């Protein structure tokens with residue numbers, strides 16, 4: 059079992075949980091590919107059997123009558139139908155486990171506190187839309203954000219998938235420009251074009267909230283505008299740089315990923331949007347300062363009267379820190395939940411400790427857990443980590459177009 | 460079987476075909492990635508054959524008279540002696556290759572410019588000291604630093620190694636207390652205790668340059684005072700924070716790693732100190748702000764009158780940036796070569812581009828290439844990378860005790 063050191067404290071642990079890693083990653087003894095962003099009834103049964111074992115362990119009923127009976131029921135259902143259905147309590151447990159198992163999530167100290175909306179009876183894209191609106195409403199909670207997932211019907215033989223075409227429930231449009239530039243968010247050019255192609259009348263601002271493209275089984279995607287009073291946004295200002303407000307920057311309250319596949323015990327839920335709350339570096343560092351995103355770093359630095367003619371003035375570092383200060387201040391001012399990267403990584407360290415006691419390890423992707431500014435100022439930088447895949451899991455999947 | 464590698468800032472794609480040549484298996488498997496872990500008779504002929512072939516291809520002389528002749532001589536030497544001697548030009552070529560192959564080095568744009576001092580006729584620790592003193596004076600060059608390596612005799616069976624017990628040629632002492640805590644550098648408490656144990660009168664300061672412990676084969680180490688005029692140091696001041704000087708901080712000019720093992724063509728050099736120049740985050744972020752190093756961050760924030768009562772003021776990030784400014788300002792004022800993390804990573808992207816054309820890829824350790832502050836503000840953050848072991852190489856080796 060891999061030995062793991064924390065270099066700040068000197069403590070050492072062994073990740074025994076990694077030995078149970080079912081599915082395989084991209085690395086080999088010849089080469090490590092850890093930095094890459096994107097690396098049959100019998101096999102359904104063995105996946106299902108392992109999940110049921112997980113579930114009955116969690117409720118202190120391993121080896122019990124109810125445990126063996128459920129294993130038998132699942133085998134019989136797979137034999138008779140090619141698939142099986144989760145019980146409601148199994149779905150809740152499995153959704154929480156998938157979050158808990160997500161190696162790239164620094165917010166997992168919260169994994170036990172997750173509101174699970176069971177939408178597996180959803181019949182249409184129109185009912186899908188209503189479920190999504192109520193997710194957004196519940197999760198936003200007027201700024202006091204609450205973690206939630208809504209689970210739409212599973213993939214099954216004989217029917218297409220439910221899919222949310224949007225990568226998040228709330229996203230800003232990206233309009234390819236006349237001269238080849240992008241107005242708004244360059245990350246969203248593709249989905250923006252698809253929305254227009256599907257009847258949306260575009261805007262022309264930098265922060266136009268996109269409509270939803272929702273796909274019911276064997277249906278074209280259908281366009282739905284979000285009710286604007288459901289989409290809580292935060293205008294960005296800085297506590298001491300009064301000109302910052304004149305940038306006209308905004309971001310939205312709710313980070314709700316909507317393009318990932320939820321896998322539980324072999325069953326696949328291609329539509330299962332989940333939401334928490336932001337860590338401020340996601341907005342202030344990546345979304346606003348990535349060169350291929352809003353790319354505001356140099357404009358802020360010039361307004362700050364920094365010397366942008368030389369790298370050794372650290373103008374980039376200074377401007378990025380104040381942009382992150384603006385995000386934290388603005389969300390706090392607006393009474394919208396947000397966590398800074400110091401508080402988040404501190405809580406993740408407690409999560410690793412909890413998980414070492416509970417499970418003998420914790421799958422974690424160092425390059426995603428360490429924040430994109432001030433890396434070695436946070437405790438996770440000095441913590442060696444073991445990255446591996448456990449199920450239940452959130453998985454990437456191809457775009458439906 | 461050729462990993463696809465994407466740069467996410469630009470969208471460009473390359474394939475690392477060089478990875479298909481990796482010799483020493485790394486620590487990762489398809490079941491788990493260990494990429495964040497700091498530390499994971501005549502097969503000598505196959506390693507020598509391969510290295511000789513490397514040398515002659517690099518001079519456009521594969522399959523020619525001198526190539527075959529050199530192949531026979533190493534064969535004859537190993538048959539008659541069980542080992543072989545590197546030609547002078549081969550030692551130079553191999554040192555530069557080991558540097559070029561170092562996956563954790565962001566400074567490899569310089570790999571072609573390296574001064575190699577051949578100390579393979581060395582004997583006794585007194586000779587090492589004069590060799591080390593020659594290196595330090597050459598490398599330091601009154602602040603206009605020049606990359607250099609000194610290669611002491613290779614390991615041979617039945618006889619002890621040449622070893623430098625210090626991890627660097629210049630290191631500050633770390634002294635315990637009437638209460639456990641350390642005055643000076645906590646990274647060097649052990650070698651301080653070893654140096655004192657061998658007769659060195661310790662100082663009482665936070666920045667006392669340690670003596671050298673130099674080990675001739677099968678002899679105990681010998682203490683050597685470094686000539687103080689040969690140890691160039693930089694008092695740290697800040698361009699605008701007038702009180703920063705009064706903190707009494709210093710760092711040394713020359714980063715000279717002296718505990719790693721150089722391996723060329725199957726031959727091993729446990730004493731081969733190499734030096735370049737600092738990247739400013741090494742000093743300003745890790746050495747001065749790591750909690751287990753000088754841990755100065757909060758003292759600087761107090762002096763800056765920052766709100767240390769909440770993490771979301773980003774007082775840590777602000778104090779860190781100003782410490783890095785102070786490092787850069789002070790080295791530039793002292794006319795000592797230094798490179799900031801923005802300049803260094805941009806040069807590394809150019810190195811990756813050069814290596815793509817020259818060799819079809821480049822072994823790179825993402826977690827070590829991305830700087831410890833402002834990670835996603837540097838281009839390497841957005842570059843996918845492949846990590847693997849090529850030879851010649853710098854390897855880690857156990858403490859010689």
Ligand code: HEM
Pocket residue numbers: 153157160162163164165166168172205206207318332333334335336337340397402426452
């Ligand atoms: C409660 C507050 C939460 C915080 C502060 C948080 C934080 C984060 C952050 C910073 C990332 C990296 C995202 C990026 O760089 O793009 C992430 C990834 C992720 N989070 Fe969490 N998260 C939270 C809640 C949740 C919840 C409720 C779930 C699921 C039930 C979840 C599942 C995931 C997954 C699957 C990823 C990986 C996404 C990917 O790699 O594409 N997170 N989280």
Ligand code: HEM
Pocket residue numbers: 554558561563564565566567569573606607608733734735736737738741798803827853
């Ligand atoms: C010339 C300017 C140079 C710069 C700016 C530079 C920069 C760096 C940096 C920042 C690191 C990370 C080390 C740490 O985090 O403590 C590193 C590692 C390393 N450097 Fe360079 N370096 C330079 C020259 C050299 C030379 C001349 C050699 C060898 C001949 C070399 C070989 C290495 C090796 C082997 C490592 C890996 C250390 C390890 O794996 O622990 N570097 N370099």
Ligand SMILES: Cc1cc(N)nc(-c2cc(CN3CC(F)(F)C3)cc(F)c2F)c1
Pocket residue numbers: 095165313314315332333334335336337340
């Ligand atoms: C629940 C939750 C909370 C939170 N704080 N963040 C996220 C979150 C996750 C991602 C993953 N994306 C796919 C990619 F790899 F492209 C990047 C992207 C974002 F923008 C996010 F906000 C999700």
Ligand SMILES: Cc1cc(N)nc(-c2cc(CN3CC(F)(F)C3)cc(F)c2F)c1
Pocket residue numbers: 497714715716733734735736737738741
């Ligand atoms: C030639 C050169 C230039 C430069 N800029 N840095 C280094 C350098 C390398 C290391 C590696 N060490 C192993 C560990 F992980 F323990 C840390 C440590 C340092 F302190 C350094 F300064 C070397």
Ligand SMILES: C[C@H](O)[C@H](O)[C@H]1CNc2nc(N)[nH]c(=O)c2N1
Pocket residue numbers: 093094095425426427467840841842843844
């Ligand atoms: C190429 C590299 O893996 C990529 O830029 C990663 C690095 N770490 C990350 N970490 C987080 N949290 N989010 C990201 O999108 C990324 N991107």
Ligand SMILES: C[C@H](O)[C@H](O)[C@H]1CNc2nc(N)[nH]c(=O)c2N1
Pocket residue numbers: 065439440441442443495496497826827828
């Ligand atoms: C645990 C983690 O691997 C460790 O802290 C690493 C991370 N990246 C690093 N990167 C560099 N350049 N130097 C280091 O010492 C480290 N330390």
Ligand SMILES: [Cl-]
Pocket residue numbers: 313340345
């Ligand atoms: Cl986002």
Ligand SMILES: [Cl-]
Pocket residue numbers: 714741746
């Ligand atoms: Cl150092």
Ligand SMILES: [Gd+3]
Pocket residue numbers: 298299300
């Ligand atoms: Gd003002």
Ligand SMILES: [Gd+3]
Pocket residue numbers: none
């Ligand atoms: Gd303007």
Ligand SMILES: [Gd+3]
Pocket residue numbers: none
């Ligand atoms: Gd005062």
Ligand SMILES: [Zn+2]
Pocket residue numbers: 085089090091092487491492493494
């Ligand atoms: Zn790996």
